Amino acid sequence: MKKVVAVVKLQLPAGKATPAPPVGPALGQHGANIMEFVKAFNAATANMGDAIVPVEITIYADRSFTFVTKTPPASYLIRKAAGLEKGAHKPGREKVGRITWEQVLEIAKQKMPDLNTTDLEAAARMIAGSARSMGVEVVGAPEVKDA
């Protein structure tokens, strides 16, 4: 049958896989493999860049289970433009804070995996009002054009 009778919900920081996870004693009754369940996290979550990535190990009826790591927020990429978080290889010399409409697009592009948008400007329209919540000044977005 294999049915999603239930699923585990937990949250942990990237790169913190330990032998004593929050589901350790709650997974031994399924896989019975701790190390084999941790090594799959230290190389999954850690592979991001300082951020929380909660996993949802789906527990089927009594056959097998699933697992997936949720990627970080778009903000993690916004810091690239200005230069707040760890970053390198920039167009400027050595300054951080405030960017242009070119930077926002530099990220929106790769951020078009599921986004139902083809135009970079059509997918950045939302990215321009995102970082604004953190504390950045959007510039380079004049009176757009729509038909």
From Swiss-Prot:
Listed GO CC annotations: cytosolic large ribosomal subunit
Q: How is it modified after translation?
A: One or more lysine residues are methylated.
Top-rank lineage group of the source organism: Bacteria
Q: Name one Pfam family in it.
A: Ribosomal_L11
**Disulfide connectivity?**
none
Subunit relationships: Part of the ribosomal stalk of the 50S ribosomal subunit. Interacts with L10 and the large rRNA to form the base of the stalk. L10 forms an elongated spine to which L12 dimers bind in a sequential fashion forming a multimeric L10(L12)X complex.
In UniProt terms, what function does this protein have?
Answer: Forms part of the ribosomal stalk which helps the ribosome interact with GTP-bound translation factors.
Among PANTHER family, the record links this protein to: 60S RIBOSOMAL PROTEIN L12 (PTHR11661), LARGE RIBOSOMAL SUBUNIT PROTEIN UL11M (PTHR11661:SF1)
* Name assigned to this protein: Large ribosomal subunit protein uL11
- Species of origin reads Thermus thermophilus
